[PDB]
Amino acid sequence: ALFVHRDTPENNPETPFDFTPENYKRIEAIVKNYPEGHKAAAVLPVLDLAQRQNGWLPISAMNKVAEILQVPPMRVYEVATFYTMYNRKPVGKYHIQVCTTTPCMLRNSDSILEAIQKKLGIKVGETTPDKLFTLIEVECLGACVNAPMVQINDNYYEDLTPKDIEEIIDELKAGKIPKPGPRSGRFSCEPAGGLTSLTEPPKGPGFGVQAGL
């Protein structure tokens, strides 16, 4: 995608955007986390809050944040185009993001990628005509030991197989919200087939404390 903005009827400075009263109270708390005189530090969390309210970042949403914090609009444009979690175009309701870096690739992230494409009938980077799904590849999501995995919106679905991902889309497409986490048999990052450690009960308070403390 591009890193220059061209006004369009859906996306121009007069596209209506404003924070709801509830989000203004949240904005106040975000801004209070930083030293007085350095309110520019609130740009990232407040752009994200704008995107969480709206789904994506119209140019008018960017200008509102620059106005609230009194930072030049350009300095908000630079942030919006730098960090990849900001959507400068409308996405689908369920933003499916498939990790394809080497650790996930080594565990057959391609099979997951093709499972979703045939299921939804789209290619990477596209949105379904019903505007429910958007498919994109992404770099390591920090869940490598549970590869292959995808992130849908705020949730991670891990240890996936082509069947498991096709099922998840069916639940989402059916109005249900599938449960995040590994889909194979384990709970998180433990070895599959039995823990190799942390089987004895953890020690209680005061165990091992060095003398004289």
**CA distances (Å), origin 57, targets 47, 62, 75, 203:** 8, 7, 15, 49
CB of 159 to ligand FES, least distance (A): 12
Would you say 140 is a known binding-site residue? yes
Strand order in the sheet with 150-152: 133-138, 94-99, 150-152, 155-158, 181-182
| Interface ranges with ligand FES (CB under 6 A) | 99, 101, 103-104, 140-144, 147, 149
Q: Is 189 annotated as a binding residue?
A: no
- Structure-token match 């061209």, residue found: 6
What value, to the nearest 5°, has the Cα angle with vertex 98 and ends 92 and 104? Answer: 175
Confirm or reject binding of residue 25 to other proteins (CB under 8 A).
yes
Q: Which one of other proteins, ligand FES, none is in contact with 34 (Cβ closer than 5 to 8 A by kind)?
A: other proteins
How near is the Cβ of 151 to ligand FES at its closest, in Å? 9
Question: How many residues belong to the site for other proteins (CB under 8 A)?
Answer: 90
How does 93-116 read in b/e, with b if 16+ C-beta sit within 10 Å?
Answer: ebbbbbbbeeebeebebeebbebb
Pick one of other proteins, ligand FES, none as the site partner of residue 124 (Cβ within 5 to 8 A by kind): none
Of the residues 8, 67, 89, 102, which one makes contact with other proteins according to CB under 8 A: 102
Query: Which residues are annotated as part of the binding site for [2Fe-2S] cluster?
Result: 99, 104, 140, 144
Binding residues: 99, 104, 140, 144
